[PDB]
């Protein structure tokens, strides 16, 4: 499973500041992998925080709690 | 028509994010609510924006308008284990 | 070079403490000795992140000398910051 | 008040992968101002948190509470 090349291309293109900017094909495949790693890390950290609170259901509070260090780790 | 294209992109990100997150739910024995999945999709959408803006500025720093694998390696510069996987995921491509 | 690290940490520590007293006066607080030590250690460690990024950014531009362009990139997400440090730097 | 140019140059150089990497005078002055702002922001955030708890004494737990957001606002 993972993000389609076209989804990543459209995502990046939507967010560029400069109309000149483009992404070559190899970088697109690498960014699809990096985005999948990001999602998996977000979900795994949120799940571990719920388990730390002895909970079966992961709530949006749990995502909010892990988000700061998640973002710092992907700088 | 711009907003139709954006909504479709958001939907694509969401269902793929949700598919990936449920693999993790199973390995950990928890359930993500639909709002937790929606929150992770939205964070992922906004993190793609952070990634895109960095890649753009990294490429421009090297006097390029085209983003390459070297700019992606720079995004991963701070995690050797992440940089290591991306680096030789990258070198498969350049060999073909 | 036997004492370089110790000397840098000490110089960073006492300057950090001095700078914190301006904030203590402005907010009417007292920073504990351990709080100041914590802030100076965070600063020492964060300086490493800054330094390694600057070095890599210069190499990415095919330079072995770091310039203000590399600092601008370091501050790419803090335009208010970059603009203040540039203004304070020109206060020179 | 602030960090000496010598301190900032040696501090950056200590942390380079290659000690021969150079840094020009403009970049050193910008980095001195950046580190001063970083210290003052860390101190102000910790103080501003201790005041939220109705305390005039700022302790290390207050630094710990504000650190993730401090780093997020600088990276």
Numbering used by the authors:
A (entry chain C), D (entry chain D): 6 to 80
B (entry chain B): 8 to 103
C (entry chain A): 9 to 100
Task: Please share excerpts from the published article on this structure.
The purified tripartite complex was crystallized under various conditions and three different crystals were obtained from similar crystallization conditions. Unexpectedly, structure determination revealed that one of the crystals contained the FANCM–MHF complex but that the other two contained the MHF complex without FANCM. The tetrahedral and rod-shaped crystals contained only MHF. The root-mean-square displacement (r.m.s.d.) of the heterodimer region was 0.5–0.6 Å. The structural alignment of the heterotetramer also showed high similarity (r.m.s.d. of 0.8 Å). How FANCM dissociates from MHF was further investigated and it was found that the presence of 2-methyl-2,4-pentanediol (MPD) and an oxidative environment may have promoted its release. However, under these conditions MHF retained its complexed form.
